[PDB]
PDB file of C-alpha atoms and ligand atoms in Angstrom:
ATOM      1  CA  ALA Y   1      -6.159  -4.138  -5.030  1.00  0.00           C
ATOM      2  CA  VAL Y   2      -6.107  -0.440  -6.059  1.00  0.00           C
ATOM      3  CA  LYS Y   3      -3.854   2.494  -5.046  1.00  0.00           C
ATOM      4  CA  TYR Y   4      -6.068   5.541  -5.720  1.00  0.00           C
ATOM      5  CA  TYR Y   5      -5.300   9.158  -6.075  1.00  0.00           C
ATOM      6  CA  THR Y   6      -7.602  12.166  -5.793  1.00  0.00           C
ATOM      7  CA  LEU Y   7      -8.432  14.841  -8.398  1.00  0.00           C
ATOM      8  CA  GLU Y   8      -6.690  17.174  -5.885  1.00  0.00           C
ATOM      9  CA  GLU Y   9      -3.454  15.289  -6.599  1.00  0.00           C
ATOM     10  CA  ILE Y  10      -4.075  14.454 -10.212  1.00  0.00           C
ATOM     11  CA  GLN Y  11      -4.501  18.110 -11.250  1.00  0.00           C
ATOM     12  CA  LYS Y  12      -1.491  19.007  -9.094  1.00  0.00           C
ATOM     13  CA  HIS Y  13       0.772  16.334 -10.690  1.00  0.00           C
ATOM     14  CA  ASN Y  14       1.118  18.319 -13.920  1.00  0.00           C
ATOM     15  CA  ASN Y  15       4.406  20.305 -13.996  1.00  0.00           C
ATOM     16  CA  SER Y  16       7.877  18.818 -14.567  1.00  0.00           C
ATOM     17  CA  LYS Y  17       7.800  16.877 -11.340  1.00  0.00           C
ATOM     18  CA  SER Y  18       5.105  14.349 -12.104  1.00  0.00           C
ATOM     19  CA  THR Y  19       2.646  14.362 -15.010  1.00  0.00           C
ATOM     20  CA  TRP Y  20      -0.527  12.354 -14.260  1.00  0.00           C
ATOM     21  CA  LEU Y  21      -3.567  11.660 -16.508  1.00  0.00           C
ATOM     22  CA  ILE Y  22      -6.869   9.738 -16.277  1.00  0.00           C
ATOM     23  CA  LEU Y  23      -7.374   7.073 -18.978  1.00  0.00           C
ATOM     24  CA  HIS Y  24     -10.583   5.123 -18.167  1.00  0.00           C
ATOM     25  CA  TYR Y  25     -10.667   6.251 -14.471  1.00  0.00           C
ATOM     26  CA  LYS Y  26      -7.301   4.543 -13.826  1.00  0.00           C
ATOM     27  CA  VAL Y  27      -4.480   7.108 -13.243  1.00  0.00           C
ATOM     28  CA  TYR Y  28      -1.357   7.097 -15.395  1.00  0.00           C
ATOM     29  CA  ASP Y  29       1.983   8.743 -14.482  1.00  0.00           C
ATOM     30  CA  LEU Y  30       4.508   9.211 -17.260  1.00  0.00           C
ATOM     31  CA  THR Y  31       6.824  12.234 -16.699  1.00  0.00           C
ATOM     32  CA  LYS Y  32       9.850  10.463 -18.303  1.00  0.00           C
ATOM     33  CA  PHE Y  33       7.838   9.318 -21.349  1.00  0.00           C
ATOM     34  CA  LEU Y  34       7.242  13.010 -22.081  1.00  0.00           C
ATOM     35  CA  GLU Y  35      10.788  12.868 -23.542  1.00  0.00           C
ATOM     36  CA  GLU Y  36       9.996   9.871 -25.803  1.00  0.00           C
ATOM     37  CA  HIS Y  37       6.382  10.531 -26.820  1.00  0.00           C
ATOM     38  CA  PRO Y  38       5.937  11.292 -30.580  1.00  0.00           C
ATOM     39  CA  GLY Y  39       3.030  13.574 -29.537  1.00  0.00           C
ATOM     40  CA  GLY Y  40       5.541  15.551 -27.384  1.00  0.00           C
ATOM     41  CA  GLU Y  41       5.114  16.841 -23.833  1.00  0.00           C
ATOM     42  CA  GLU Y  42       3.294  20.236 -24.093  1.00  0.00           C
ATOM     43  CA  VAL Y  43      -0.027  18.954 -25.558  1.00  0.00           C
ATOM     44  CA  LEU Y  44       0.123  15.856 -23.297  1.00  0.00           C
ATOM     45  CA  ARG Y  45       1.117  17.956 -20.255  1.00  0.00           C
ATOM     46  CA  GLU Y  46      -1.899  20.164 -20.924  1.00  0.00           C
ATOM     47  CA  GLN Y  47      -4.242  17.125 -21.128  1.00  0.00           C
ATOM     48  CA  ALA Y  48      -2.474  15.866 -17.998  1.00  0.00           C
ATOM     49  CA  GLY Y  49      -4.096  16.477 -14.619  1.00  0.00           C
ATOM     50  CA  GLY Y  50      -7.424  15.566 -16.092  1.00  0.00           C
ATOM     51  CA  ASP Y  51      -9.259  13.007 -18.156  1.00  0.00           C
ATOM     52  CA  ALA Y  52      -7.188  12.421 -21.283  1.00  0.00           C
ATOM     53  CA  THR Y  53      -9.234   9.264 -21.980  1.00  0.00           C
ATOM     54  CA  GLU Y  54     -11.262  10.552 -24.955  1.00  0.00           C
ATOM     55  CA  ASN Y  55      -8.182  12.321 -26.388  1.00  0.00           C
ATOM     56  CA  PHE Y  56      -6.054   9.149 -26.102  1.00  0.00           C
ATOM     57  CA  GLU Y  57      -8.702   7.109 -27.950  1.00  0.00           C
ATOM     58  CA  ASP Y  58      -9.345   9.994 -30.395  1.00  0.00           C
ATOM     59  CA  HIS Y  59      -5.706   9.800 -31.533  1.00  0.00           C
ATOM     60  CA  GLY Y  60      -6.271   6.051 -32.215  1.00  0.00           C
ATOM     61  CA  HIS Y  61      -3.218   4.991 -30.175  1.00  0.00           C
ATOM     62  CA  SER Y  62      -1.616   1.613 -31.005  1.00  0.00           C
ATOM     63  CA  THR Y  63      -1.466  -1.550 -28.855  1.00  0.00           C
ATOM     64  CA  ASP Y  64       2.183  -0.808 -27.885  1.00  0.00           C
ATOM     65  CA  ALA Y  65       1.075   2.594 -26.507  1.00  0.00           C
ATOM     66  CA  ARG Y  66      -1.962   0.927 -24.857  1.00  0.00           C
ATOM     67  CA  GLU Y  67       0.316  -1.792 -23.341  1.00  0.00           C
ATOM     68  CA  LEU Y  68       2.630   1.057 -22.224  1.00  0.00           C
ATOM     69  CA  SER Y  69      -0.401   2.723 -20.595  1.00  0.00           C
ATOM     70  CA  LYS Y  70      -0.936  -0.445 -18.530  1.00  0.00           C
ATOM     71  CA  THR Y  71       2.584  -0.324 -17.123  1.00  0.00           C
ATOM     72  CA  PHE Y  72       2.113   3.456 -16.571  1.00  0.00           C
ATOM     73  CA  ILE Y  73      -0.891   2.753 -14.268  1.00  0.00           C
ATOM     74  CA  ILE Y  74       0.140   4.127 -10.830  1.00  0.00           C
ATOM     75  CA  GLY Y  75      -3.251   4.863  -9.492  1.00  0.00           C
ATOM     76  CA  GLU Y  76      -6.926   5.383  -9.926  1.00  0.00           C
ATOM     77  CA  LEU Y  77      -9.005   8.550  -9.861  1.00  0.00           C
ATOM     78  CA  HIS Y  78     -10.709   8.475  -6.471  1.00  0.00           C
ATOM     79  CA  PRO Y  79     -14.343   7.448  -5.747  1.00  0.00           C
ATOM     80  CA  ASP Y  80     -15.575  10.489  -3.852  1.00  0.00           C
ATOM     81  CA  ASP Y  81     -14.179  12.306  -6.897  1.00  0.00           C
ATOM     82  CA  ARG Y  82     -14.890  10.594 -10.297  1.00  0.00           C
TER      83      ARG Y  82
HETATM   84  C1  LIG A   1      -0.423   6.590 -21.780  1.00  0.00           C
HETATM   85  C2  LIG A   1       0.333   7.516 -22.395  1.00  0.00           C
HETATM   86  C3  LIG A   1       0.511   7.465 -23.895  1.00  0.00           C
HETATM   87  C4  LIG A   1       1.403   6.676 -24.579  1.00  0.00           C
HETATM   88  C5  LIG A   1       2.068   5.413 -24.097  1.00  0.00           C
HETATM   89  C6  LIG A   1       1.492   7.228 -25.910  1.00  0.00           C
HETATM   90  C7  LIG A   1       2.279   6.686 -26.926  1.00  0.00           C
HETATM   91  C8  LIG A   1       2.309   7.206 -28.218  1.00  0.00           C
HETATM   92  C9  LIG A   1       3.060   6.628 -29.304  1.00  0.00           C
HETATM   93  C10 LIG A   1       4.005   5.453 -29.205  1.00  0.00           C
HETATM   94  C11 LIG A   1       2.732   7.333 -30.442  1.00  0.00           C
HETATM   95  C12 LIG A   1       2.925   6.865 -31.867  1.00  0.00           C
HETATM   96  C13 LIG A   1       1.655   6.211 -32.437  1.00  0.00           C
HETATM   97  C14 LIG A   1       1.253   4.935 -31.695  1.00  0.00           C
HETATM   98  O1  LIG A   1       2.159   4.150 -31.347  1.00  0.00           O
HETATM   99  O2  LIG A   1       0.031   4.728 -31.525  1.00  0.00           O
HETATM  100  C15 LIG A   1       1.966   8.487 -30.025  1.00  0.00           C
HETATM  101  C16 LIG A   1       1.570   9.526 -30.873  1.00  0.00           C
HETATM  102  C17 LIG A   1       0.818  10.632 -30.451  1.00  0.00           C
HETATM  103  N1  LIG A   1       0.233  10.844 -29.242  1.00  0.00           N
HETATM  104 FE1  LIG A   1       0.434   9.558 -27.589  1.00  0.00          FE
HETATM  105  N2  LIG A   1       0.667   8.327 -25.966  1.00  0.00           N
HETATM  106  C18 LIG A   1       0.020   8.491 -24.775  1.00  0.00           C
HETATM  107  C19 LIG A   1      -0.922   9.448 -24.411  1.00  0.00           C
HETATM  108  C20 LIG A   1      -1.324  10.481 -25.251  1.00  0.00           C
HETATM  109  C21 LIG A   1      -2.320  11.470 -24.916  1.00  0.00           C
HETATM  110  C22 LIG A   1      -3.182  11.541 -23.678  1.00  0.00           C
HETATM  111  C23 LIG A   1      -2.313  12.374 -25.947  1.00  0.00           C
HETATM  112  C24 LIG A   1      -2.965  13.732 -25.894  1.00  0.00           C
HETATM  113  C25 LIG A   1      -2.174  14.821 -25.794  1.00  0.00           C
HETATM  114  C26 LIG A   1      -1.436  11.918 -26.992  1.00  0.00           C
HETATM  115  C27 LIG A   1      -1.215  12.577 -28.208  1.00  0.00           C
HETATM  116  C28 LIG A   1      -0.435  12.040 -29.236  1.00  0.00           C
HETATM  117  C29 LIG A   1      -0.181  12.680 -30.508  1.00  0.00           C
HETATM  118  C30 LIG A   1      -0.559  14.086 -30.926  1.00  0.00           C
HETATM  119  C31 LIG A   1       0.548  11.791 -31.268  1.00  0.00           C
HETATM  120  C32 LIG A   1       1.101  12.029 -32.652  1.00  0.00           C
HETATM  121  C33 LIG A   1       0.479  11.118 -33.718  1.00  0.00           C
HETATM  122  C34 LIG A   1       1.527  10.749 -34.760  1.00  0.00           C
HETATM  123  O3  LIG A   1       2.421   9.956 -34.391  1.00  0.00           O
HETATM  124  O4  LIG A   1       1.428  11.278 -35.887  1.00  0.00           O
HETATM  125  N3  LIG A   1      -0.874  10.758 -26.522  1.00  0.00           N
HETATM  126  N4  LIG A   1       1.684   8.324 -28.699  1.00  0.00           N
END
């Protein structure tokens, strides 16, 4: 199955409430992880509500972070959208 979520929402979910990002067209909520993340919130929150796919890869994130990303999957970025 899929859950889907629209760019409308994904942009919106970006401000200390929910923080959503697109990593390979799947949609990833963190919000709590913002606390943990070595990269910090700000930078991530600013990539949030958009495609952070390239950026995520660019940083060369580890398997554990990748794994984490799987469990963070809430959603997908809608088809009408893309
Ligand atoms: C799915 C959400 C993500 C998770 C689970 C995650 C996890 C992590 C973890 C655990 C580290 C340490 C290095 C590693 O384990 O690879 C890290 C570092 C970092 N991340 Fe992320 N990250 C995520 C998304 C992002 C995104 C989209 C950005 C873009 C803002 C980003 C920017 C950074 C930066 C700047 C560092 C610092 C590199 C260092 O440790 O020196 N991360 N991340």
